[PDB]
Amino acid sequence: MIVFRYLSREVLVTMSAVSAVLLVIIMSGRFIKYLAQAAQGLLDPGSLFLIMAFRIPGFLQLILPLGLFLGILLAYGRLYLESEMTVLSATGMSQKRLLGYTMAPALLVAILVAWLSLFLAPQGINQFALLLNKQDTLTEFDTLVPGRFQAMRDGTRVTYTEELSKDRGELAGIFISQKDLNSSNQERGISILVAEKGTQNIQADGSRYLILHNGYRYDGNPGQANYRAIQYDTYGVMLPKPEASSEVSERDAVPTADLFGSDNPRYQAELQWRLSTPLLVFVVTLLAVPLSRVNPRQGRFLKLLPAILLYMGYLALLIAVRGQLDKGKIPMAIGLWWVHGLFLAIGLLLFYWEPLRLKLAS
Amino acid sequence: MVKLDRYIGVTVFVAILAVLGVILGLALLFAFIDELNDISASYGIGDALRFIFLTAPRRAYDMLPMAALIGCLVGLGTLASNSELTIMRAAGVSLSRIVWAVMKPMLVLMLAGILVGEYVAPWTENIAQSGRALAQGGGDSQSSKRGLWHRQGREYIHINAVQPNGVLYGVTRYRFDEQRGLESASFAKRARFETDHWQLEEVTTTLLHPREKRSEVVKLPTERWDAQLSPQLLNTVVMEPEALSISGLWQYIHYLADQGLNNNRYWLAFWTKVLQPLVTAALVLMAISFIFGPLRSVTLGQRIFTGVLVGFVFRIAQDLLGPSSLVFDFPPLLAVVIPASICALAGVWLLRRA
Amino acid sequence: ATLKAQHLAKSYKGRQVVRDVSMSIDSGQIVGLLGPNGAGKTTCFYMIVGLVQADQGVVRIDEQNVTHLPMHGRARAGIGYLPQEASIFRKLSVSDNIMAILETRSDLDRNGRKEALEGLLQEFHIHHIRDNLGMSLSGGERRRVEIARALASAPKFILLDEPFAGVDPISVGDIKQIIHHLKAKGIGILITDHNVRETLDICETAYIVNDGQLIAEGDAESILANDLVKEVYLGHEFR
Amino acid sequence: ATLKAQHLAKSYKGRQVVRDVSMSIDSGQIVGLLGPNGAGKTTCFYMIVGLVQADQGVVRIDEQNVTHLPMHGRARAGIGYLPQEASIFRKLSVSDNIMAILETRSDLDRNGRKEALEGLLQEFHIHHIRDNLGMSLSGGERRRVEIARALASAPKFILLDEPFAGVDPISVGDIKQIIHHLKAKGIGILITDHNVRETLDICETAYIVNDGQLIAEGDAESILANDLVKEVYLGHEFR
């Protein structure tokens, strides 16, 4: 029992330190990507603070299992290097007993990760998406110079402006037209008009009531003998906020109570993914114990990089299977469970290597 | 002092080459895994593999400094843990002499990095990007992301896709009158650059008649085009600043200066691509300081782990000071000088502490 | 009891390090295992301990084939061990360094564990440092605590590893006294060491393993006078 | 020449590990440095060689204050060093190990370097093994090549560090012969070792330090009878 408390307190502290370092690194890595979009001027650089505070629960869901993996590796390597475990196995301690001792601090991490992945990360992601949609769309429309006009990616909103204005009054004039004719093969595909109007009548989050009293439609399909030119009023330009749809998805914010009963493959793959990190904790704990046996020449800082690579590959396989399963390609009976089975098997063949060799030695 | 110089130089050179090979392999594997998600229809696995392989020199040039740091750490640790640098120091060989011995085969690496990043990286990067864009699409007037818009007093120019070999895919020309009267809806497929004019191809123009006549389609085969655009100008705008040759970056910085638009990202890219030897020298000086200090008798694994951790901490800071120098207002030269400078200062401090 | 190693053999990357070495330790004896550094002295010692798997031969303790048993199986069979390096529980008090092993014993109840802890703490004269942490102990007391801890498991044999290496000439007296005490308790002891003077002083029967073979054996007088060990190991001018 | 160290003192954790110890080695004699493990023997040795800067000290080589000089600065005036562990250049031949150090010397031309290399190769009887890689040498010849390489720099005092550690009793005769060979040339050795029985034999003057203070000095017969050392370090029954 004394050994149990000693091992648990030696593992938990190292896990905590490694998790803190990993969290700092991941937060910095995400900041260096959000700051680029801030530099483009798309998003207010005063709200990057909250976004981090709302996204960190989503990072302490894939960081904690790796923190436990590295903590077990480092702690048991330290105990192995100082002959602290040689005198523990020379008084009677099966490696099964060591696994039993290690599985108790892993239970706390599994409980914490299950809570964070089933009841906290969805709430945080929902709040982050809500507050990014609410008031961060004020910078959706940015104008640099009259030389750089507006060419929206929708393929229907392209126009011209003269010298811009801070008050948004001097950038009048409009040459709006859908203009998807190429060789002028269609008539309804252009809404060309001549305008000196286009006042920035922003009512909603960028939505504009830019009705133009100046405009002459040129509907007549060019390249033909049909000249059709009438008066044109305007083409409504409402600006929505597509930032949220580019980075996150609706699935990650659905409460767990809304996935227990459903027929949508995405809403069920999400449930299968959320219940995968508690098993991640136990699988990496099982993998960690046989790996931690090190020699004085190897040191404890040797198999850390392969451990990180293996964990990243495990997560990548989980995500790929989820993304090829929510499409219905894989029937939702095997699920993600075969990935867990594969990694459990490769951990079991590693925990039972020395006993297998001894048995094969007859 | 010849044999000691060759011994240390060969050791560090081989270690650096091995580390660079491993890092390049890992980077290519991660990039291919990321690219797998966009495999659809025309973008086959073969095209993705071709793009990944063609973007190898750029990744090697980018990862050269971290590779040099880790390789110097490993190579000097091999000597130090065997208690050979102590013998060299006790034989009368100074410490600055050992630093010079390590840096002698490293000016070669810095020169190779500059050469491969100013002559070889832009070509392969351009070829790979253009090939990926072609494979993904660009058939329509506005289909490919690799597009651009140019305007004159009345001439309107839109290019659907640009080619590395001085060719434009999807040339589109428009003409608006002084009263915003439409006069041309020209379409083209290809163009050839001769003298200063632009030899258009597949000219499917559509010129509007003002009074009552509806436009007509003239399928003229070729026509010289009077445009001030140069193929270098259209190539430079498309490519990202971090994938441009030094001479091209300098010329584009000056050209942006003439028109009055401020240049603050191209300046940062130019400084990063120029001050790379100094950053490498600072990093490897700090690595040499590490070997002679804390990581003296520690194992190889600890040295590799420390090198990787510090490389992460350094690269993250370097990539974080970039957009910060554009959001805020301070010279981009600081964003390149500060991290390398403090690395060199820490290395010198620890070396003087012996 | 009797720990016997018979026809032991091993081979590292082609070369045969040891071959046909036979040793036997009785309960109560102090048997020393010496030899040249490059020979298979350490290989034989670790093959008996359990850290290296023997290619051939058997290792049995009183009709109990423990050759193909792990280290914990051997430890439960009766064989102890004590590594050369410092192997005390650093962040644990002395009174807990022993109780952490006394709690695994099956024949001891709640009161028996306390009684045995008191006996072990008083026998070795470490009662005054009962509260000190393991990392703060001096060089002399660390060995006493380690021996008491290894004795808390009630081993039938203890295989010391380089007890006298890096030890002052005044502290070898304490180690010899501890070894004599352990012999008096009835526990057979196997000693392997680089220092061949104090080891031959304390041991009662010694084995020489040179070129992977048992070239000579016997007491101190018969081992200091043999010609083979005097021309491959000791030198013609040794005492 | 005379390597007189005066009034040495140091402190690691605010505590005076070494205080007021003075040693003097004439050029042409073998001097030993002994003491308990925790005392200031290794610290004093490392301060003399230069790896540990001394807070106080007048270390001088015949009226040449070299206390502030670095390790290479001290070695330029001529002070050898030989690490306890293997320090052979791994991927270099024996003929290259000596020549690499010889090229450091500034008073030798090409023909002089060649002649000195042949002289050193023949002097230490390693002319036959002049092409084997340094990493593929047995312990018997590795030490000879290391000592030849150390002598290639032409020092005036060689500071050996644990030469008789982890060697067989037949392999101490070779080391003693080599040390006598070095003493014949004129160098002044400063053997320091854990083992005392032959360290007090080969050497002719010992400086035993305890609690970071010089407690005794003199010839082996004149120190084995000292009461203080027989109380703290050597015990009451040594020899």
Author numbering:
A (entry chain F): 1 to 362
B (entry chain G): 1 to 354
C (entry chain B), D (entry chain A): 2 to 240
The authors write:
Three distinct conformations of LptB2FG, designated as LptB2FG-I, LptB2FG-II, and LptB2FG-III, were captured in our cryo-EM data and solved to resolutions of 3.34 Å, 3.26 Å, and 3.31 Å, respectively. The main difference between the three cryo-EM structures of LptB2FG is in the conformation of the β-jellyroll domain, which appears to perform a rigid body rotation motion with respect to the outer leaflet of the IM, transitioning from one conformational state to the other. The TMD and NBD domains of these three structures are essentially the same. In contrast to all the reported structures of LptB2FG determined by cryo-EM, our cryo-EM structures did not reveal any density consistent with the presence of LPS within the outward-facing cavity of the TMDs. This cavity has a volume of 5,473 Å3, approximately half the volume observed in the X-ray structure (10, 513 Å3), suggesting that the previously solved structure may represent an LPS-bound conformation. Intriguingly, our structures of LptB2FG exhibit an open V-shaped cleft at Interface 1, oriented toward the outer leaflet of the inner membrane, while Interface 2 remains entirely closed. This structural feature is expected to facilitate lipids entering the TMD domain of LptB2FGC via Interface 1. The distinctive structural attributes characterising our cryo-EM LptB2FG structures strongly suggest that we have captured the resting state, or substrate-free conformation, of this transporter. In the LptB2FG-I structure, we observed PE1, PE3, and PE4.
